[PDB]
Amino acid sequence: TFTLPDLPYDYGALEPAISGEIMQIHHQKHHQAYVTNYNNALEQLDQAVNKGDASTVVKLQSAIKFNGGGHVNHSIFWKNLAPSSEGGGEPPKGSLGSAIDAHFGSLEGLVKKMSAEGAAVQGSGWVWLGLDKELKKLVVDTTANQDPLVTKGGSLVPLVGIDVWEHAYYLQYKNVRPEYLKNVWKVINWKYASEVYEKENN
Amino acid sequence: FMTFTLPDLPYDYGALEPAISGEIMQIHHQKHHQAYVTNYNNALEQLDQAVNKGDASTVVKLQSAIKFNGGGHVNHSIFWKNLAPSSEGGGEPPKGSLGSAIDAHFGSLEGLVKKMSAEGAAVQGSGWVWLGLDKELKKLVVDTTANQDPLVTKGGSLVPLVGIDVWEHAYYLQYKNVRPEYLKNVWKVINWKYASEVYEKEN
Amino acid sequence: FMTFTLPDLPYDYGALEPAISGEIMQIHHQKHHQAYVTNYNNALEQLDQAVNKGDASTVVKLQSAIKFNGGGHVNHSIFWKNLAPSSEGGGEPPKGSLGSAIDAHFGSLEGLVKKMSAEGAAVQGSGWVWLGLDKELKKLVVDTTANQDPLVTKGGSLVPLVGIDVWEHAYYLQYKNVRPEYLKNVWKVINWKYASEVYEKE
Amino acid sequence: TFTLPDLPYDYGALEPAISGEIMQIHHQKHHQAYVTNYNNALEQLDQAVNKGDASTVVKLQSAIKFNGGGHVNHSIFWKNLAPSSEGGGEPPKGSLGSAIDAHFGSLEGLVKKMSAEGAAVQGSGWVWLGLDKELKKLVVDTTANQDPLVTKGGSLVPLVGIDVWEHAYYLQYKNVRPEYLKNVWKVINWKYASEVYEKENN
Ligand SMILES: [Mn+2]
Ligand SMILES: [Mn+2]
Ligand SMILES: [Mn+2]
Ligand SMILES: [Mn+2]
């Protein structure tokens, strides 16, 4: 079974970019539920898999992907954020900084691309910076709902995720998702992104 | 072609309280629906252009924006009409043929309510739960759609009778993460008179 | 966990002629269904490993292959059983309660046949058309699924009674592009006896 | 309205890679149907758009995308194929050849990648070599059913498509889609791809 991980900073530490009220609900309620529902779906899967019940194994895939994906994505999300005073918003250095310049022209090129993609997500979803381990390239992509980046390709590793579910910004920014996407860059932990990039693992 | 406009609500913004806050009604109408309306108009202008120029690729590329914003407009226009203040019939059970049909298909009104609540609660991400009429069989269905897909994308002979918006902007300011509490209270302001009338004429 | 095997057909490869050629039954069974079974078994081995190692990302990455090959196995196992040679009851109308429910829900057996045929003809790409039982409401439904998604992915309380495969490999060698002709003839060998039993037993 | 385009070679000219029988049905029946139904859907679309019928405009989106996409994808397909004796299968020269080496290591790299993606398509679809006009990069991607590559990104332009619908190989290769995908490369028209790349239009 899985447990809700602690945040590496206080709930209020990403303000003003993200309010403490959102961080608290987002962590303790939304992420907590994915964890608990993933644990439950896993218990059922284990039974079905052991019993040779193919139909129930397939039936369980919706719940497994959604809550397991939910757990994966938010565990990553919390780690690719950091307070402005602790490195949040500081541009990536080294190879990732370079690779980003090579693939997107500049950090602002990437920020614009990911901001555009995030604003255009229909309904609930995520925008990602990823590393394609196969082709050795950085990619930008979105996933729907709680689908994790690896569902877009087995060789992809997420470096940065930005949650564009309404629960990620609505208490603070209401309908204005572009303002949320404008500000979130202030607390993006590019150090985290760099380490994942350097190791090719989260 | 025709441009579309934001329809007026049939009641004041605060009229659905306490079930749905006036703050939610106002933003939902003036910001979310309006954006679907305006982005639908813009998509139509490009579509009209692409169709006239014989640009098949752009016609098809535009289907995403057309379905999302056209869908958004359809769905919210219905949503506003299938809500009503409690003092004007909101939350009063359906009478006549729809009431009969509901008892026939779902056992009872509460059976239907249980079903739609369960379905709405289980919607992953953004979407809608619907009570619909299949015009072919003259039968009732409950179904969900993702994002702003309207019920007609699940079958061309379907007519939506009642929609419940389960996008987070439909409830988050008031109920936060607790969608089931929203789904518990939304039934107080469901306009079953609208659903009955739609059922009766089948559109 | 359990391994799965290709089930035997309840009749000879050629027994469904003229509606479905033996060449199709053979390749469809020995090659297509067999691949789903084997790829389902391989995905389960990786799933079991991932689940045991606490690897959420791999469990979720594997859901595509699990649903596709697991669904493929489920769907084809049902499909073989809801066909029968005309001389063994294939094409004979449902009796008992199902016949009644069909009359109640669709007007007549032909109302139903027209509906499933229209739905099958209209399937974009690969998929299935179903007569299903909603166990909660004790009601009949007609629905389609894409690729190898089983009916149970449309609602956990659904039980498939009759499936018609409208993947091109179910008909192409015999009917080529004319899927409606396939859908005209397949009704000669629909095993409504299986459907009744399932209906009666849920 | 649209009309069925002539092929740039005889039905049998792509043998042995693709049989003349497939080419003939694929062109005259499958593509013809997409053209005719697109024409019908556009007429209905035109009425609904003129009448201000939002609900019907959206209902027609499924038919517009499938049949419109079908016309687009197959119109391209015919042009990015050519007889081996007339330039089919000759590696791309000039900028596209360079770009392929830059992005995929080698033409064989690209071929392996696209073949792998094609084999893994679940149900009906396409594998594409595309040009991202925004990022100025080559990409490989798949689409489902008749979705054209532009539904994956508004700035994408397809250079090469390979149809992996079963009707594209089944009469000849039956279930062995990997053998179809192995041979199709002998008749890929890389000169067409180059022209598109050089001008950024089909
Ligand atoms: Mn979230
Ligand atoms: Mn809404
Ligand atoms: Mn099959
Ligand atoms: Mn084709």
PDB file of C-alpha atoms in Angstrom, chain C:
ATOM      1  CA  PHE C   1      -1.426 -15.192 -10.557  1.00  0.00           C
ATOM      2  CA  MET C   2      -3.137 -17.421 -13.107  1.00  0.00           C
ATOM      3  CA  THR C   3      -2.088 -17.915 -16.720  1.00  0.00           C
ATOM      4  CA  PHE C   4      -4.809 -18.025 -19.413  1.00  0.00           C
ATOM      5  CA  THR C   5      -5.161 -20.358 -22.423  1.00  0.00           C
ATOM      6  CA  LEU C   6      -6.926 -20.170 -25.795  1.00  0.00           C
ATOM      7  CA  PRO C   7     -10.372 -21.738 -25.311  1.00  0.00           C
ATOM      8  CA  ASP C   8     -11.673 -24.316 -27.817  1.00  0.00           C
ATOM      9  CA  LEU C   9     -14.544 -23.266 -30.030  1.00  0.00           C
ATOM     10  CA  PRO C  10     -17.772 -25.118 -29.310  1.00  0.00           C
ATOM     11  CA  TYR C  11     -18.031 -26.098 -33.016  1.00  0.00           C
ATOM     12  CA  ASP C  12     -15.667 -26.751 -35.982  1.00  0.00           C
ATOM     13  CA  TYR C  13     -13.961 -23.829 -37.778  1.00  0.00           C
ATOM     14  CA  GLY C  14     -16.251 -24.336 -40.752  1.00  0.00           C
ATOM     15  CA  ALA C  15     -19.461 -24.836 -38.840  1.00  0.00           C
ATOM     16  CA  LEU C  16     -20.702 -21.274 -39.168  1.00  0.00           C
ATOM     17  CA  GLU C  17     -20.737 -21.213 -42.979  1.00  0.00           C
ATOM     18  CA  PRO C  18     -22.117 -19.663 -45.041  1.00  0.00           C
ATOM     19  CA  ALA C  19     -22.495 -16.643 -42.696  1.00  0.00           C
ATOM     20  CA  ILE C  20     -18.864 -16.783 -41.550  1.00  0.00           C
ATOM     21  CA  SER C  21     -16.243 -18.550 -43.596  1.00  0.00           C
ATOM     22  CA  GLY C  22     -14.041 -21.171 -41.984  1.00  0.00           C
ATOM     23  CA  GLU C  23     -10.925 -19.311 -43.127  1.00  0.00           C
ATOM     24  CA  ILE C  24     -12.004 -16.342 -41.009  1.00  0.00           C
ATOM     25  CA  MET C  25     -12.962 -18.503 -37.974  1.00  0.00           C
ATOM     26  CA  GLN C  26      -9.573 -20.178 -38.118  1.00  0.00           C
ATOM     27  CA  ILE C  27      -7.302 -17.144 -38.421  1.00  0.00           C
ATOM     28  CA  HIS C  28      -9.564 -15.183 -36.054  1.00  0.00           C
ATOM     29  CA  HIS C  29      -9.290 -17.887 -33.350  1.00  0.00           C
ATOM     30  CA  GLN C  30      -5.777 -19.306 -33.752  1.00  0.00           C
ATOM     31  CA  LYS C  31      -3.975 -16.061 -34.530  1.00  0.00           C
ATOM     32  CA  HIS C  32      -5.938 -13.008 -33.232  1.00  0.00           C
ATOM     33  CA  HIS C  33      -7.529 -14.347 -30.032  1.00  0.00           C
ATOM     34  CA  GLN C  34      -4.375 -16.368 -29.293  1.00  0.00           C
ATOM     35  CA  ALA C  35      -2.242 -13.212 -29.477  1.00  0.00           C
ATOM     36  CA  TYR C  36      -4.532 -11.413 -26.962  1.00  0.00           C
ATOM     37  CA  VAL C  37      -4.237 -14.342 -24.545  1.00  0.00           C
ATOM     38  CA  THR C  38      -0.473 -14.489 -24.815  1.00  0.00           C
ATOM     39  CA  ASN C  39      -0.001 -10.729 -24.620  1.00  0.00           C
ATOM     40  CA  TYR C  40      -2.461 -10.678 -21.755  1.00  0.00           C
ATOM     41  CA  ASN C  41      -0.346 -13.299 -19.934  1.00  0.00           C
ATOM     42  CA  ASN C  42       2.871 -11.296 -20.515  1.00  0.00           C
ATOM     43  CA  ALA C  43       1.271  -8.039 -19.290  1.00  0.00           C
ATOM     44  CA  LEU C  44       0.037  -9.838 -16.157  1.00  0.00           C
ATOM     45  CA  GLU C  45       3.557 -11.053 -15.409  1.00  0.00           C
ATOM     46  CA  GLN C  46       4.847  -7.447 -15.646  1.00  0.00           C
ATOM     47  CA  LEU C  47       1.805  -6.184 -13.736  1.00  0.00           C
ATOM     48  CA  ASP C  48       2.335  -8.714 -10.916  1.00  0.00           C
ATOM     49  CA  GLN C  49       6.015  -7.708 -10.751  1.00  0.00           C
ATOM     50  CA  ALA C  50       5.231  -3.962 -10.782  1.00  0.00           C
ATOM     51  CA  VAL C  51       2.498  -4.344  -8.143  1.00  0.00           C
ATOM     52  CA  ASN C  52       4.831  -6.316  -5.862  1.00  0.00           C
ATOM     53  CA  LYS C  53       7.679  -3.811  -6.274  1.00  0.00           C
ATOM     54  CA  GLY C  54       5.369  -0.874  -5.383  1.00  0.00           C
ATOM     55  CA  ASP C  55       5.968   0.660  -8.804  1.00  0.00           C
ATOM     56  CA  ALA C  56       2.845   2.810  -9.362  1.00  0.00           C
ATOM     57  CA  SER C  57       4.109   4.318 -12.626  1.00  0.00           C
ATOM     58  CA  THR C  58       4.615   0.902 -14.238  1.00  0.00           C
ATOM     59  CA  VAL C  59       1.231  -0.404 -12.960  1.00  0.00           C
ATOM     60  CA  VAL C  60      -0.424   2.575 -14.658  1.00  0.00           C
ATOM     61  CA  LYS C  61       1.725   2.363 -17.833  1.00  0.00           C
ATOM     62  CA  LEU C  62       0.646  -1.292 -18.141  1.00  0.00           C
ATOM     63  CA  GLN C  63      -3.105  -0.524 -18.021  1.00  0.00           C
ATOM     64  CA  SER C  64      -3.247   0.063 -21.798  1.00  0.00           C
ATOM     65  CA  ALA C  65      -1.870  -3.441 -22.602  1.00  0.00           C
ATOM     66  CA  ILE C  66      -3.920  -5.000 -19.781  1.00  0.00           C
ATOM     67  CA  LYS C  67      -7.193  -3.524 -21.057  1.00  0.00           C
ATOM     68  CA  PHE C  68      -6.396  -4.218 -24.716  1.00  0.00           C
ATOM     69  CA  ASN C  69      -5.273  -7.850 -24.430  1.00  0.00           C
ATOM     70  CA  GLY C  70      -7.346  -8.625 -21.377  1.00  0.00           C
ATOM     71  CA  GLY C  71     -10.378  -7.111 -23.079  1.00  0.00           C
ATOM     72  CA  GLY C  72      -9.504  -8.965 -26.278  1.00  0.00           C
ATOM     73  CA  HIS C  73      -9.533 -12.281 -24.407  1.00  0.00           C
ATOM     74  CA  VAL C  74     -12.825 -11.525 -22.645  1.00  0.00           C
ATOM     75  CA  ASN C  75     -14.521 -10.274 -25.790  1.00  0.00           C
ATOM     76  CA  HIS C  76     -13.503 -13.164 -28.003  1.00  0.00           C
ATOM     77  CA  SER C  77     -14.278 -15.809 -25.343  1.00  0.00           C
ATOM     78  CA  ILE C  78     -17.830 -14.428 -25.172  1.00  0.00           C
ATOM     79  CA  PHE C  79     -18.059 -14.018 -28.985  1.00  0.00           C
ATOM     80  CA  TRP C  80     -17.302 -17.726 -29.671  1.00  0.00           C
ATOM     81  CA  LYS C  81     -19.990 -18.822 -27.220  1.00  0.00           C
ATOM     82  CA  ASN C  82     -22.657 -16.448 -28.581  1.00  0.00           C
ATOM     83  CA  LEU C  83     -22.330 -18.020 -32.036  1.00  0.00           C
ATOM     84  CA  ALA C  84     -23.698 -21.441 -33.039  1.00  0.00           C
ATOM     85  CA  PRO C  85     -24.223 -23.455 -36.248  1.00  0.00           C
ATOM     86  CA  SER C  86     -27.751 -22.948 -37.590  1.00  0.00           C
ATOM     87  CA  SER C  87     -28.316 -26.700 -37.075  1.00  0.00           C
ATOM     88  CA  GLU C  88     -27.470 -26.346 -33.373  1.00  0.00           C
ATOM     89  CA  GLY C  89     -29.704 -23.382 -32.609  1.00  0.00           C
ATOM     90  CA  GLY C  90     -27.779 -20.571 -34.310  1.00  0.00           C
ATOM     91  CA  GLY C  91     -30.136 -17.886 -35.601  1.00  0.00           C
ATOM     92  CA  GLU C  92     -33.044 -19.228 -33.514  1.00  0.00           C
ATOM     93  CA  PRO C  93     -34.908 -16.450 -31.645  1.00  0.00           C
ATOM     94  CA  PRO C  94     -34.593 -16.092 -27.859  1.00  0.00           C
ATOM     95  CA  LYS C  95     -37.406 -17.655 -25.841  1.00  0.00           C
ATOM     96  CA  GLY C  96     -38.453 -17.225 -22.212  1.00  0.00           C
ATOM     97  CA  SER C  97     -37.728 -14.046 -20.282  1.00  0.00           C
ATOM     98  CA  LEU C  98     -35.104 -12.596 -22.625  1.00  0.00           C
ATOM     99  CA  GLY C  99     -37.461 -12.762 -25.579  1.00  0.00           C
ATOM    100  CA  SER C 100     -39.961 -10.884 -23.414  1.00  0.00           C
ATOM    101  CA  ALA C 101     -37.407  -8.336 -22.244  1.00  0.00           C
ATOM    102  CA  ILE C 102     -36.300  -7.849 -25.844  1.00  0.00           C
ATOM    103  CA  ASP C 103     -39.923  -7.291 -26.910  1.00  0.00           C
ATOM    104  CA  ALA C 104     -40.432  -4.920 -23.959  1.00  0.00           C
ATOM    105  CA  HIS C 105     -37.244  -2.947 -24.604  1.00  0.00           C
ATOM    106  CA  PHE C 106     -36.943  -2.987 -28.370  1.00  0.00           C
ATOM    107  CA  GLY C 107     -40.478  -3.680 -29.618  1.00  0.00           C
ATOM    108  CA  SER C 108     -39.538  -6.948 -31.316  1.00  0.00           C
ATOM    109  CA  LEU C 109     -36.504  -9.070 -32.042  1.00  0.00           C
ATOM    110  CA  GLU C 110     -36.209  -7.238 -35.404  1.00  0.00           C
ATOM    111  CA  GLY C 111     -36.314  -3.870 -33.684  1.00  0.00           C
ATOM    112  CA  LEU C 112     -33.274  -5.090 -31.753  1.00  0.00           C
ATOM    113  CA  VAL C 113     -31.538  -6.577 -34.785  1.00  0.00           C
ATOM    114  CA  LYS C 114     -32.019  -3.319 -36.741  1.00  0.00           C
ATOM    115  CA  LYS C 115     -30.576  -1.316 -33.852  1.00  0.00           C
ATOM    116  CA  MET C 116     -27.487  -3.492 -33.338  1.00  0.00           C
ATOM    117  CA  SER C 117     -26.925  -3.599 -37.090  1.00  0.00           C
ATOM    118  CA  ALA C 118     -27.095   0.209 -37.415  1.00  0.00           C
ATOM    119  CA  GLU C 119     -24.790   0.614 -34.451  1.00  0.00           C
ATOM    120  CA  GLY C 120     -22.314  -1.929 -35.837  1.00  0.00           C
ATOM    121  CA  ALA C 121     -22.290  -0.308 -39.276  1.00  0.00           C
ATOM    122  CA  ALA C 122     -21.587   3.092 -37.703  1.00  0.00           C
ATOM    123  CA  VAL C 123     -18.630   2.029 -35.550  1.00  0.00           C
ATOM    124  CA  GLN C 124     -15.624   4.172 -36.562  1.00  0.00           C
ATOM    125  CA  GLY C 125     -12.524   2.037 -36.777  1.00  0.00           C
ATOM    126  CA  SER C 126     -12.327  -1.185 -34.750  1.00  0.00           C
ATOM    127  CA  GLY C 127     -14.863  -2.207 -32.083  1.00  0.00           C
ATOM    128  CA  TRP C 128     -17.775  -4.270 -30.855  1.00  0.00           C
ATOM    129  CA  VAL C 129     -21.537  -3.945 -30.781  1.00  0.00           C
ATOM    130  CA  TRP C 130     -23.285  -5.318 -27.674  1.00  0.00           C
ATOM    131  CA  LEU C 131     -26.568  -6.452 -26.287  1.00  0.00           C
ATOM    132  CA  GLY C 132     -25.972  -6.111 -22.539  1.00  0.00           C
ATOM    133  CA  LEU C 133     -27.835  -6.581 -19.272  1.00  0.00           C
ATOM    134  CA  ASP C 134     -27.796  -3.748 -16.731  1.00  0.00           C
ATOM    135  CA  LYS C 135     -27.903  -5.850 -13.530  1.00  0.00           C
ATOM    136  CA  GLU C 136     -28.703  -2.965 -11.190  1.00  0.00           C
ATOM    137  CA  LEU C 137     -31.803  -1.882 -13.135  1.00  0.00           C
ATOM    138  CA  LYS C 138     -32.480  -5.399 -14.545  1.00  0.00           C
ATOM    139  CA  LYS C 139     -32.629  -3.780 -17.993  1.00  0.00           C
ATOM    140  CA  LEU C 140     -31.371  -4.424 -21.523  1.00  0.00           C
ATOM    141  CA  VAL C 141     -28.924  -2.119 -23.305  1.00  0.00           C
ATOM    142  CA  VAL C 142     -27.310  -1.814 -26.717  1.00  0.00           C
ATOM    143  CA  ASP C 143     -23.900  -0.215 -26.767  1.00  0.00           C
ATOM    144  CA  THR C 144     -20.633  -0.184 -28.635  1.00  0.00           C
ATOM    145  CA  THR C 145     -17.037  -0.356 -27.321  1.00  0.00           C
ATOM    146  CA  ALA C 146     -13.832   0.682 -29.100  1.00  0.00           C
ATOM    147  CA  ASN C 147     -11.003  -1.677 -30.002  1.00  0.00           C
ATOM    148  CA  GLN C 148     -11.014  -4.459 -27.380  1.00  0.00           C
ATOM    149  CA  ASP C 149     -12.664  -2.521 -24.498  1.00  0.00           C
ATOM    150  CA  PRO C 150     -15.050  -4.918 -22.885  1.00  0.00           C
ATOM    151  CA  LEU C 151     -18.659  -3.903 -22.219  1.00  0.00           C
ATOM    152  CA  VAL C 152     -17.946  -3.789 -18.479  1.00  0.00           C
ATOM    153  CA  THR C 153     -15.885  -0.624 -19.118  1.00  0.00           C
ATOM    154  CA  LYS C 154     -19.177   1.147 -19.911  1.00  0.00           C
ATOM    155  CA  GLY C 155     -20.591   0.405 -16.429  1.00  0.00           C
ATOM    156  CA  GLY C 156     -19.506  -2.057 -13.779  1.00  0.00           C
ATOM    157  CA  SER C 157     -22.989  -3.603 -13.519  1.00  0.00           C
ATOM    158  CA  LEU C 158     -23.178  -4.535 -17.220  1.00  0.00           C
ATOM    159  CA  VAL C 159     -23.195  -8.104 -18.420  1.00  0.00           C
ATOM    160  CA  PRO C 160     -22.688  -8.765 -22.124  1.00  0.00           C
ATOM    161  CA  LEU C 161     -25.332 -11.068 -23.628  1.00  0.00           C
ATOM    162  CA  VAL C 162     -24.435 -10.843 -27.321  1.00  0.00           C
ATOM    163  CA  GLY C 163     -21.390  -9.328 -28.957  1.00  0.00           C
ATOM    164  CA  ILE C 164     -20.740  -8.805 -32.652  1.00  0.00           C
ATOM    165  CA  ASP C 165     -17.082  -8.167 -33.589  1.00  0.00           C
ATOM    166  CA  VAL C 166     -16.858  -5.374 -36.188  1.00  0.00           C
ATOM    167  CA  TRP C 167     -13.091  -5.271 -36.433  1.00  0.00           C
ATOM    168  CA  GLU C 168     -12.292  -5.660 -40.124  1.00  0.00           C
ATOM    169  CA  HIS C 169     -10.541  -9.019 -39.444  1.00  0.00           C
ATOM    170  CA  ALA C 170     -13.944 -10.473 -38.403  1.00  0.00           C
ATOM    171  CA  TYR C 171     -15.305 -10.067 -41.916  1.00  0.00           C
ATOM    172  CA  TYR C 172     -12.788  -8.724 -44.438  1.00  0.00           C
ATOM    173  CA  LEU C 173     -11.616 -11.929 -46.109  1.00  0.00           C
ATOM    174  CA  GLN C 174     -15.226 -12.766 -46.956  1.00  0.00           C
ATOM    175  CA  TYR C 175     -17.144  -9.507 -47.186  1.00  0.00           C
ATOM    176  CA  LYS C 176     -14.286  -7.085 -47.817  1.00  0.00           C
ATOM    177  CA  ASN C 177     -15.410  -3.492 -47.221  1.00  0.00           C
ATOM    178  CA  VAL C 178     -19.123  -4.339 -47.053  1.00  0.00           C
ATOM    179  CA  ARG C 179     -19.573  -4.516 -43.275  1.00  0.00           C
ATOM    180  CA  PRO C 180     -23.372  -4.143 -43.588  1.00  0.00           C
ATOM    181  CA  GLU C 181     -23.552  -7.455 -45.517  1.00  0.00           C
ATOM    182  CA  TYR C 182     -21.595  -9.145 -42.736  1.00  0.00           C
ATOM    183  CA  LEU C 183     -23.977  -7.631 -40.221  1.00  0.00           C
ATOM    184  CA  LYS C 184     -26.907  -8.959 -42.310  1.00  0.00           C
ATOM    185  CA  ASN C 185     -25.651 -12.513 -42.234  1.00  0.00           C
ATOM    186  CA  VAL C 186     -24.129 -12.856 -38.793  1.00  0.00           C
ATOM    187  CA  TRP C 187     -27.659 -13.049 -37.376  1.00  0.00           C
ATOM    188  CA  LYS C 188     -28.034 -16.513 -38.979  1.00  0.00           C
ATOM    189  CA  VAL C 189     -25.585 -17.878 -36.450  1.00  0.00           C
ATOM    190  CA  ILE C 190     -26.253 -15.808 -33.319  1.00  0.00           C
ATOM    191  CA  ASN C 191     -26.597 -18.153 -30.365  1.00  0.00           C
ATOM    192  CA  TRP C 192     -29.640 -16.664 -28.563  1.00  0.00           C
ATOM    193  CA  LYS C 193     -29.683 -19.708 -26.283  1.00  0.00           C
ATOM    194  CA  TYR C 194     -26.380 -18.561 -24.740  1.00  0.00           C
ATOM    195  CA  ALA C 195     -27.762 -15.048 -24.399  1.00  0.00           C
ATOM    196  CA  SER C 196     -30.907 -16.353 -22.638  1.00  0.00           C
ATOM    197  CA  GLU C 197     -28.886 -18.420 -20.193  1.00  0.00           C
ATOM    198  CA  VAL C 198     -26.628 -15.504 -19.347  1.00  0.00           C
ATOM    199  CA  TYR C 199     -29.675 -13.262 -19.040  1.00  0.00           C
ATOM    200  CA  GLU C 200     -31.299 -15.782 -16.661  1.00  0.00           C
ATOM    201  CA  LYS C 201     -28.136 -16.321 -14.582  1.00  0.00           C
ATOM    202  CA  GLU C 202     -26.565 -12.825 -14.806  1.00  0.00           C
TER     203      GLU C 202
END
